[PDB]
Amino acid sequence: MFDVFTRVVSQADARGEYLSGSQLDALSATVAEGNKRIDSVNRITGNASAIVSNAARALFAEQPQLIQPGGNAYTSRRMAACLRDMEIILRYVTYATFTGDASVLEDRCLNGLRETYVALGVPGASVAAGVQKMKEAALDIVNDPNGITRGDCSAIVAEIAGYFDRAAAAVA
Amino acid sequence: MFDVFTRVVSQADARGEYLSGSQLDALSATVAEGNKRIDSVNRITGNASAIVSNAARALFAEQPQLIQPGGNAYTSRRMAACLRDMEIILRYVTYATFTGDASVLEDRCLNGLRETYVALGVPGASVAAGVQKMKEAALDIVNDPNGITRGDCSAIVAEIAGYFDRAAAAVA
Amino acid sequence: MFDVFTRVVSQADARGEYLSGSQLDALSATVAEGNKRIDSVNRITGNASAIVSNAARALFAEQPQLIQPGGNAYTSRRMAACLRDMEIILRYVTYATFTGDASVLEDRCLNGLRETYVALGVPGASVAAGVQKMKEAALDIVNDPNGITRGDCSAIVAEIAGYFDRAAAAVA
Amino acid sequence: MFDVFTRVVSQADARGEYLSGSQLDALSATVAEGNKRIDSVNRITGNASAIVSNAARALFAEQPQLIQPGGNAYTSRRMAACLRDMEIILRYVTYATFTGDASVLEDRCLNGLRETYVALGVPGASVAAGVQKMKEAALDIVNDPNGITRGDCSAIVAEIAGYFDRAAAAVA
Amino acid sequence: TSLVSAQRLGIVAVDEAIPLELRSRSTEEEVDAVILAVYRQVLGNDHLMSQERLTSAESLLRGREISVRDFVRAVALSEVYRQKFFHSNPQNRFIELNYKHLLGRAPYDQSEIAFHTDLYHQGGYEAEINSYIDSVEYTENFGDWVVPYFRGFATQRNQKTVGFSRSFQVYRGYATSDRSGSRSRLTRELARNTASPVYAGSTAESLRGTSAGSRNQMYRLQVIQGAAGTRVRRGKAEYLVSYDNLSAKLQQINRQGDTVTMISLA
Amino acid sequence: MKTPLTEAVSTADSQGRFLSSTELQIAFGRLRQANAGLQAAKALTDNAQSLVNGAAQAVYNKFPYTTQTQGNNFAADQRGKDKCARDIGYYLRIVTYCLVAGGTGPLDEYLIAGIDEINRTFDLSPSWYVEALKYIKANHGLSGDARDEANSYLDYAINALS
Amino acid sequence: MKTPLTEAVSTADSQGRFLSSTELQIAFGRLRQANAGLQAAKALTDNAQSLVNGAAQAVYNKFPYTTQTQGNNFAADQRGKDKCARDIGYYLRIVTYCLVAGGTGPLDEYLIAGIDEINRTFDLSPSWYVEALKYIKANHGLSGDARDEANSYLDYAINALS
Amino acid sequence: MKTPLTEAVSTADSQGRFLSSTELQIAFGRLRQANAGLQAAKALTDNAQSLVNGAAQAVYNKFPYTTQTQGNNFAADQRGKDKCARDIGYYLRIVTYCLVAGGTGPLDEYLIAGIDEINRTFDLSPSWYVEALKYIKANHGLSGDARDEANSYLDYAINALS
Ligand SMILES: *[C@@H](C)[C@H]1/C(=C/c2[nH]c(/C=C3N=C(/C=C4\NC(=O)C(CC)=C4C)C(C)=C\3CCC(=O)O)c(CCC(=O)O)c2C)NC(=O)[C@@H]1C
Ligand SMILES: *[C@@H](C)[C@H]1/C(=C/c2[nH]c(/C=C3N=C(/C=C4\NC(=O)C(CC)=C4C)C(C)=C\3CCC(=O)O)c(CCC(=O)O)c2C)NC(=O)[C@@H]1C
Ligand SMILES: *[C@@H](C)[C@H]1/C(=C/c2[nH]c(/C=C3N=C(/C=C4\NC(=O)C(CC)=C4C)C(C)=C\3CCC(=O)O)c(CCC(=O)O)c2C)NC(=O)[C@@H]1C
Ligand SMILES: *[C@@H](C)[C@H]1/C(=C/c2[nH]c(/C=C3N=C(/C=C4\NC(=O)C(CC)=C4C)C(C)=C\3CCC(=O)O)c(CCC(=O)O)c2C)NC(=O)[C@@H]1C
Ligand SMILES: *[C@H](C)[C@H]1/C(=C/c2[nH]c(/C=C3N=C(/C=C4\NC(=O)C(CC)=C4C)C(C)=C\3CCC(=O)O)c(CCC(=O)O)c2C)NC(=O)[C@@H]1C
Ligand SMILES: *[C@H](C)[C@H]1/C(=C/c2[nH]c(/C=C3N=C(/C=C4\NC(=O)C(CC)=C4C)C(C)=C\3CCC(=O)O)c(CCC(=O)O)c2C)NC(=O)[C@@H]1C
Ligand SMILES: *[C@H](C)[C@H]1/C(=C/c2[nH]c(/C=C3N=C(/C=C4\NC(=O)C(CC)=C4C)C(C)=C\3CCC(=O)O)c(CCC(=O)O)c2C)NC(=O)[C@@H]1C
Ligand SMILES: *[C@H](C)[C@H]1/C(=C/c2[nH]c(/C=C3N=C(/C=C4\NC(=O)C(CC)=C4C)C(C)=C\3CCC(=O)O)c(CCC(=O)O)c2C)NC(=O)[C@@H]1C
Ligand SMILES: *[C@H](C)[C@H]1/C(=C/c2[nH]c(/C=C3N=C(/C=C4\NC(=O)C(CC)=C4C)C(C)=C\3CCC(=O)O)c(CCC(=O)O)c2C)NC(=O)[C@@H]1C
Ligand SMILES: *[C@H](C)[C@H]1/C(=C/c2[nH]c(/C=C3N=C(/C=C4\NC(=O)C(CC)=C4C)C(C)=C\3CCC(=O)O)c(CCC(=O)O)c2C)NC(=O)[C@@H]1C
Ligand SMILES: *[C@H](C)[C@H]1/C(=C/c2[nH]c(/C=C3N=C(/C=C4\NC(=O)C(CC)=C4C)C(C)=C\3CCC(=O)O)c(CCC(=O)O)c2C)NC(=O)[C@@H]1C
Ligand SMILES: *[C@H](C)[C@H]1/C(=C/c2[nH]c(/C=C3N=C(/C=C4\NC(=O)C(CC)=C4C)C(C)=C\3CCC(=O)O)c(CCC(=O)O)c2C)NC(=O)[C@@H]1C
Ligand SMILES: *[C@H](C)[C@H]1/C(=C/c2[nH]c(/C=C3N=C(/C=C4\NC(=O)C(CC)=C4C)C(C)=C\3CCC(=O)O)c(CCC(=O)O)c2C)NC(=O)[C@@H]1C
Ligand SMILES: *[C@H](C)[C@H]1/C(=C/c2[nH]c(/C=C3N=C(/C=C4\NC(=O)C(CC)=C4C)C(C)=C\3CCC(=O)O)c(CCC(=O)O)c2C)NC(=O)[C@@H]1C
């Protein structure tokens, strides 16, 4: 996988050139944002169970066919797997947030996921909807202004929202 | 894999026939060439490192784009992988020379190599060029009249050249 | 070793507890069975040689491989050892009956006996068979209603059967 | 494993010495016996099945206890194992004959074989008897003057006898 | 196992090992790490010379042409594996090495030995090696993408308890290897379906006090004894003797005709 | 197929090694043997019919019940006698391949692997074929190296069947 | 590509775990280092032409036969000097990547893996590059954390060559 | 220990087979070669001192810096000259083993396995030893099969170093 730094290095090497002064400055701006990135990873992580269970509850209420007998999330093993997938996706979203690059999410989570669901008969569109609900609760949790040094986290929130949107698109 | 002898056996068995007198005599003619065959394998093997290294230097001199940054032979791992591939091909050509049949080279080295290189982005045409340079040096080494019981090795040299050509044609 | 009384005592001391009325009453009932316990021990002991030799003779009759040349009970030395083991087991069974607790039989006789027999090639399953024969003969002797004050010894007879069964289970 | 040549090399290298002119001559003498050695290997190999089965038949005829019910070679699985062991021993003896060194026989076949048989209750003395029968039939096959370039094979025959003897010693 | 036991038994590092899986779109470093782990496991932690590496099989794995399980099998079938573990070993030692290297456990029963001796006699070396890697046990523990790892120190479904005790015979410590052939320490206990005490890590140690002689060392002799003198109470015995009395004890055991199964420092 | 040259390369390839002097000596060993093997092949081939016919009759003589008993597995009718001659012809022809190839490779690949199952399924006695193979050993008329190599393959088959 | 951030995720992913305080502390460790690393990369980059030419001459001085002996592997001609100058530039450029990445990942991926085979195949002495790297260590003019991290990568390359 | 005889048994043992004509042919290849191998070994042995001295001098000449430069890895002093002559003697002695054994086994096990790590750790150039081996090839005075085999081992070592 890449992180925000090695992404720049890898592109530089293919061209055989040192990082420009503006590329180093840009990475310095990334470093200046490091604490907010760490806080957002910590906040999502601390609430992971709630994020998953609430989004799942919201999804099944919005989409009752999923849990009716014969529905895809019916039976304990299928429900268990569905909850696991939500958590896996959330976990890899935080990985991408931690590293500052989507490569981990794409390579280790999303690659092949659409084909997996198509083969299994998992409704990918319902997965994307559950990812949207997780996205919503996660960003509210990250933006919660209480109990934390005050500042502007809009950039990190946008970056996180992108990773969620990436996940939702990969399945839907 | 087949050798020169079992190649004829397998064909004969497929027809349920004994080898003909013509076939046995052909095999007896191969036996007469055996010493030359062995010498040619020995000579190529004794010079394997130089054949590879000189062929590679000559290839990177003619095709400097391979060894510029972002080029396919750039970075140590790719350069080392490239040199390995050259030595592998030469190794399998000596196996084919030793057995007197192309199957070992084709079954193990060449079959699927084109497709593998295409997926990797390895330039198959440049590999063929390198195989050509190894072929030219290898044939000169076999033909060196010094230090060996003089004789006509034209037949064995033509066979060895054919094996190099198979290898070259299989990558490009 | 423990006897029926010290077994209860040891458990109570570990709990830091006086024996309860029920436990004392249970021991009182044990005391009431004492004469029948004593009689059973005396009856087995008085017939010990016959019990052992008859069981041994019956064993070798049913399992002639034991005494054929090369058999584990062949040669005077091994036959003698085998007869001794039968006597040893019967003796410790009578000890356990006398004390009313298996600890003597388990600690002094059965512990490690399977390990000894496997290590030395003694056919444990045949020792078990002989023990079973000794069990049947001893119980007959204990249960004989002649020449003794009549009463119900089923509880002591059941306890004795348990000791033989332990012995048989331990060697195999 | 060592062969007759590498045996001498290994000893020489440990002493940091070139092979002495005496050692080279002794090896040259080994080479001069090469054709007899090959013939002895070929002859024993060509009769392997007869050698094993005849010796096995003779063994069981001489030692009926092996195949009586309860015997160590009774039941198809154990009889099959027994025939396998005979074949194995013969096979490694031919290996040692072929290499001119006992290392293959000792390392692959005999090392720990006594302990295996003792552990399992395989009568090692009977195995040794079986090996002896195979040895006698083998040496007669090797020494048969019919249909072979006449000469003195007494040295090779003695060496082979030594391998059979070592096997017979090892199992018991 | 937990720290309290693992520390005494010298298996803390085994307990904290994490299965290594080759993921989709792995980096060059991850492939390198996987190749290293396979060599350490399948070759029993020998020092691996660069001349011994499987150049081609490594390339194919790196190219995603073959799975991790294929690469494990390539190494197991290689001449390196053969020379290390097969050509100079008796069969039963070879088989327990295959169980350690390929399944990460010790053999459970004599019939496993019998099965694999028969298979070697029937189909040779390749058929023997393939039986481990193609087995249900291999596929369900490691599948195609996870490097094998030692399992014998953890409770496995459908294991025998004695698998745990036997693990200490084939796993001798982190800084050890299966390099010197030799005989199996398991032969007798497999053949007779028994177990042996675990003397590993610091469990071999016994108290010295003032009774351990001039060097303050005790040696633990494990013997199998019979009554061929005083009465013998157990067919299996242990003696603790100081260095100064060790020769006398051996001679005593020898004179009695009893068998020494193991000796070690205590 | 298992022959001196392919085994040499197979071993070398597994080690990722160029052929060395060890393999060259294997090639020389093959050359020493090849001409005698080719001569043995021609001699067996030329007398194939006589050998096959003779061998088939040898089996009938030693196992007369094969030509007297009715059954799919026996040669009491023309069908079985033709099966039998074919089979013996297979053994003979594949043995000549071994002489050409310089190893048991052809026997292993085409005849021996699976022969146990064939004989069991179709109730064919391997003792029949052993007798046919012995006849061929006794009548092929080879000598010297040609004889030694041919008999090794005939015995290899015989050992496989017993 | 080993770096603190990728190693943290790799470890957690192998365990199927969410990132915890342990991985958070790794990130803080990265942040504490990153600005000094970026400063070092700029300083090295701005002086690259001088460090590379100076390092190459240091190699030529220490090993004068490299500029006097004919051969493809030596730098007695302009072709070899250009190759040598290029190679040293690779080491310096890739070292600046390690400072950006905060780990040896770039050296491992781009340079170290396979360098033994290259030097062996083309008959290049690793001592030449050790001398070149030693020159850079003494002439990059860094201090503090930028010096310490930068020297670790130059030392890391040297230890790989020895 | 790659050798014709051990290879034949190793293969047969791996397959769980008796030796067959394939392995017998391998033995014949060995026998055809053995006397020449022993003769070469005798000739190299008798000339050991002159070959080693000559080879070391040929290296010192081709690489004069090795005699002029201080350092544990160079032959400026007697210590280094001793080590160097010792090393070249190892190469020669083990090559004689290969001729006796009939294969590269002795070079593989005693010398080549791990040589890369030694040369890198102690900063010894393979090119030095390559020159030594080239000299021995040019001056062992052997002919015929002895020349061919001995050169194959000398070239095997050379290729392993480059
Ligand atoms: C958007 C994400 C929200 C936000 C974040 C924010 N955080 C800081 C500063 C810090 N946060 C931490 C975090 C931790 N310290 C620890 O010991 C651990 C436990 C392992 C964690 C997670 C730290 C160390 C700092 C720096 C010190 C400080 O408290 O200031 C800031 C301030 C700016 C900065 O980049 O440091 C901000 C903005 N703030 C909001 O208002 C959002 C809701
Ligand atoms: C074309 C290949 C060149 C050529 C070859 C050539 N060789 C021979 C004859 C022999 N070569 C050998 C080889 C070896 N003997 C050994 O011991 C080893 C080392 C393991 C080797 C490689 C042998 C045994 C012979 C036969 C005896 C002899 O010394 O000649 C010939 C002659 C024809 C023949 O078939 O023998 C030839 C032609 N000759 C050339 O001119 C080409 C450059
Ligand atoms: C089952 C065991 C059988 C059985 C036993 C039984 N015995 C008694 C009573 C007594 N038995 C004795 C024993 C002895 N007195 C001695 O002097 C000796 C020698 C040391 C012995 C062994 C005694 C003293 C008594 C008590 C007095 C009496 O004679 O009765 C009973 C009666 C119940 C009781 O506990 O007293 C019983 C039941 N009776 C059977 O029918 C079983 C076959
Ligand atoms: C003791 C073993 C008996 C014996 C043997 C013996 N053999 C030879 C000579 C040869 N034997 C062979 C063998 C083969 N040639 C082949 O093609 C094959 C098949 C692969 C084999 C097994 C060969 C090649 C020779 C040399 C040529 C020849 O026919 O002479 C001798 C003679 C001495 C020698 O070393 O050559 C002897 C003595 N002889 C006996 O009397 C014993 C019963
Ligand atoms: C009744 C004894 C108590 C109770 C029940 C309760 N259950 C849920 C939610 C779920 N129940 C299940 C169970 C199953 N689903 C299956 O497919 C199967 C196997 C065939 C089982 C056993 C599941 C999966 C859920 C969650 C998803 C869903 O709602 O369908 C709830 C609501 C929980 C929530 O957060 O919505 C409740 C209330 N609750 C009590 O208090 C009763 C004593
Ligand atoms: C839940 C919101 C929805 C849902 C999910 C669902 N998924 C599966 C099964 C699988 N999911 C995956 C996905 C992954 N495995 C991984 O390792 C990773 C990458 C790290 C991912 C993303 C896989 C591979 C499977 C199949 C194997 C397995 O289940 O472990 C199921 C079960 C399908 C079945 O038939 O059993 C379900 C139910 N289903 C819904 O209805 C929701 C919309
Ligand atoms: C050198 C002249 C050219 C060159 C080569 C090059 N090849 C690769 C990668 C691979 N080559 C192979 C081929 C084989 N592997 C084997 O084991 C065998 C025998 C069966 C063969 C024929 C494979 C499988 C790979 C991929 C896996 C691996 O990297 O080892 C590379 C590396 C490419 C990359 O790392 O992305 C290179 C550079 N490249 C050139 O530019 C030359 C023309
Ligand atoms: C013959 C002179 C008289 C006789 C014999 C008789 N013996 C037994 C029983 C046994 N005999 C032995 C003896 C040995 N077993 C050994 O292993 C050895 C040492 C090698 C010897 C000497 C034994 C141990 C027994 C008992 C166990 C067994 O039956 O094998 C009997 C039967 C006794 C019984 O109760 O079954 C008899 C009849 N009897 C005469 O009247 C003869 C004059
Ligand atoms: C008879 C039914 C079977 C039989 C017996 C047999 N046992 C041994 C040897 C031993 N038996 C014991 C058992 C004990 N010794 C004790 O001191 C006690 C504790 C109170 C017990 C339970 C022991 C320790 C031994 C070994 C030492 C000794 O022999 O005294 C043998 C001899 C074994 C040998 O060959 O040495 C035999 C024959 N054998 C059978 O075949 C019957 C099934
Ligand atoms: C009877 C239908 C035909 C027949 C029989 C025959 N059998 C043998 C020899 C053996 N028979 C067996 C069989 C078994 N041994 C076992 O342990 C079991 C399983 C419990 C079986 C089925 C074995 C192993 C042998 C060989 C060893 C032995 O002799 O015990 C022979 C003699 C063969 C020989 O070469 O000595 C014979 C004659 N023969 C006929 O003609 C009948 C039609
Ligand atoms: C036959 C003459 C005698 C006999 C033999 C017998 N052996 C066993 C069991 C084993 N034999 C071996 C030996 C080897 N296996 C190998 O792979 C090799 C090296 C290539 C050797 C030397 C082994 C390992 C065993 C144990 C495993 C197995 O059972 O295969 C038995 C079976 C014992 C059992 O309890 O089943 C037998 C019968 N037995 C006799 O009675 C003859 C005297
Ligand atoms: C509970 C009453 C007592 C207790 C138990 C305890 N056991 C272990 C560890 C192991 N237990 C076993 C046993 C088995 N494994 C099997 O597969 C089988 C069936 C075939 C059995 C009987 C094993 C093998 C282990 C070790 C491996 C493992 O732990 O998985 C522990 C853990 C010890 C540690 O330090 O981890 C404990 C706690 N402990 C008590 O205090 C109770 C008296
Ligand atoms: C060098 C100062 C001394 C020396 C060393 C020597 N060691 C071995 C072999 C091994 N060394 C180890 C040690 C380890 N392996 C590990 O993984 C770990 C870390 C956890 C350690 C400490 C092992 C396991 C081996 C055996 C495996 C293998 O050799 O590959 C040798 C080789 C011996 C041989 O080739 O037989 C040597 C030479 N030897 C000396 O003379 C120095 C005093
Ligand atoms: C300089 C210290 C000395 C020197 C250098 C020299 N190098 C080469 C050839 C090569 N150098 C490399 C190195 C790399 N390639 C890479 O991709 C990387 C990683 C990013 C490195 C470090 C390689 C691979 C080659 C060979 C291929 C090529 O030609 O580029 C030469 C020429 C060697 C030849 O045979 O052509 C030279 C001269 N030479 C000296 O004398 C200096 C002391």
Q: What is the DSSP string of chain G?
A: ---HHHHHHHHHHHTT----HHHHHHHHHHHHHHHHHHHHHHHHHHTHHHHHHHHHHHHHHH-THHHHS-STTS-SSHHHHHHHHHHHHHHHHHHHHHHHHTSSHHIIIIIITTHHHHHHHHT--HHHHHHHHHHHHHHS---HHHHHHHHHHHHHHHHHH-
Q: Give the distance from residue D70's alpha carbon to the nearest chain H alpha carbon, in angstroms.
A: 30
Six-digit token string for E217: 């060392």
3-state helix, strand and coil shares in percent for chain H, rounded to the nearest 5: 80, 0, 20
Amino acid at site G75: A
- Taking the C-alpha atoms of residue H124 and residue H71, their distance in angstroms, rounded to an integer, is 11
Amino acid at site D158: A
Q: How far is CA E130 from CA C84, D88, D92, E159, F7, in A?
A: 52, 22, 24, 21, 20
Find chain B residues with C-beta within 8 A of F96's C-beta: 18-19
- Enumerate residues 84 to 123 of chain G having a beta carbon within 8 A of any beta carbon in chain B: 109-115, 117-118, 121-122
3-class DSSP state of F17: coil
Question: Do the two chains H and B touch, given a threshold of 8 Å on CB pairs and at least 3 pairs?
Answer: yes
Instruction: Choose among D142, D157, D146, D145: nearest CA to D51.
Output: D142
**């390995």: which residue's tokens?**
B84
**């006695």: which residue's tokens?**
F125
- Taking the C-alpha atoms of residue E226 and residue E257, their distance in angstroms, rounded to an integer, is 8
Six-digit token string for G36: 């000094």
- Taking the C-alpha atoms of residue H73 and residue F33, their distance in angstroms, rounded to an integer, is 52
Cβ separation of B53 and H162 shorter than 8 Å?
Answer: yes
User: Whose CA is closest to atom 28 on ligand 3?
Assistant: C149
Closest Cβ–Cβ partner in A13, A17, A104 for G110:
A13
Domain ranges of chain B: 1-172
Superfamily of domain B1-172: Phycocyanins (1.10.490.20)
| Burial class of residue C9 (count of CB atoms within 10 Å of its CB; 0-12, 13-18, 19+) | middle
E86 alpha carbon, closest ligand: 11
Q: What is the 3-state secondary structure (H, E, C) of B91-112?
A: HHHHHHHHHCCCHHHHHHHHCC
- Taking the C-alpha atoms of residue E151 and residue E104, their distance in angstroms, rounded to an integer, is 5
Six-digit token string for E49: 């010379």
Q: Give the distance from residue H87's alpha carbon to the nearest chain F alpha carbon, in angstroms.
A: 24
The data reach a resolution, in angstroms, of 1.9
Q: Ligand 7 pocket test: which of B65, B74, B122 has the largest number of ligand atoms within 8 Å of its C-beta?
A: B122
3-state helix, strand and coil shares in percent for chain F, rounded to the nearest 5: 80, 0, 20
Q: Ligand 5 pocket test: which of A53, A76, A83, A126 has the largest number of ligand atoms within 8 Å of its C-beta?
A: A76
Are C84 and E231 a contacting pair, CB within 8 Å? no
Q: Give the distance from residue F31's alpha carbon to the nearest chain B alpha carbon, in angstroms.
A: 6
Six-digit token string for C22: 């029920």
Find chain E residues with C-beta within 8 A of H15's C-beta: 124-125
Find chain E residues with C-beta within 8 A of H160's C-beta: 51
- Taking the C-alpha atoms of residue F147 and residue F141, their distance in angstroms, rounded to an integer, is 8
Amino acid at site B171: V
Are F14 and F120 a contacting pair, CB within 8 Å? no
Report chain B residues touching chain F, CB-CB < 8 A. Answer: 1-6, 8-10, 12-13, 16-19, 21, 24, 27-28, 31, 34-35, 37-38, 41-42, 45, 48, 91, 94-95, 98-100, 104, 108
Are F136 and F154 a contacting pair, CB within 8 Å? yes
3-class DSSP state of C56: helix
Q: Give the distance from residue C35's alpha carbon to the nearest chain E alpha carbon, in angstroms.
A: 34
Cβ separation of F155 and D47 shorter than 8 Å?
Answer: yes
CATH architecture of F1-162: Orthogonal Bundle (1.10)
Question: Taking every pair of C-alpha atoms in chain D, what is the biggest distance, in angstroms?
Answer: 61
- Taking the C-alpha atoms of residue C121 and residue C103, their distance in angstroms, rounded to an integer, is 27
- Taking the C-alpha atoms of residue E109 and residue F25, their distance in angstroms, rounded to an integer, is 45
A45 alpha carbon, closest ligand: 1
Six-digit token string for E52: 């011994």
Instruction: Choose among H55, D1, D91: nearest CA to E124.
Output: D91
Cβ separation of D28 and H38 shorter than 8 Å?
Answer: yes
Q: Ligand 6 pocket test: which of A68, A85, A107, A171 has the largest number of ligand atoms within 8 Å of its C-beta?
A: A85
3-class DSSP state of B154: helix
Enumerate neighbours of C (3 or more CB pairs within 8 A).
D, E
Six-digit token string for E123: 């189909």
Amino acid at site E45: N
DSSP readout, B29-67? HHHHTHHHHHHHHHHHHHTHHHHHHHHHHHHHHH-GGGG
Six-digit token string for H1: 């220990």
Six-digit token string for G15: 């365990």
Domain ranges of chain H: 1-162
Element (H, E) at F98: helix F78-101
Are D5 and D98 a contacting pair, CB within 8 Å? no
Are H35 and D31 a contacting pair, CB within 8 Å? yes
Question: Do the two chains A and H touch, given a threshold of 8 Å on CB pairs and at least 3 pairs?
Answer: no
User: Whose CA is closest to atom 30 on ligand 3?
Assistant: C149
Six-digit token string for A132: 């949207």
- Taking the C-alpha atoms of residue F48 and residue D166, their distance in angstroms, rounded to an integer, is 45
Six-digit token string for H162: 């480059």
Q: How far is CA A93 from CA A99, A157, H154, in A?
A: 10, 12, 59
- Taking the C-alpha atoms of residue D122 and residue D134, their distance in angstroms, rounded to an integer, is 18
Regarding the beta carbon of E155 and ligand 12, being less than 6 Å apart is answered yes
Instruction: Choose among E244, G35, G18: nearest CA to A29.
Output: G35
Instruction: Choose among H141, H156, H24, H49: nearest CA to H95.
Output: H156
Q: How far is CA D107 from CA D96, E128, F108, H93, in A?
A: 11, 19, 28, 28
Q: Which of A7, A108, A110 to mutate to test the interface with E (most CBs of E within 10 A)?
A: A108
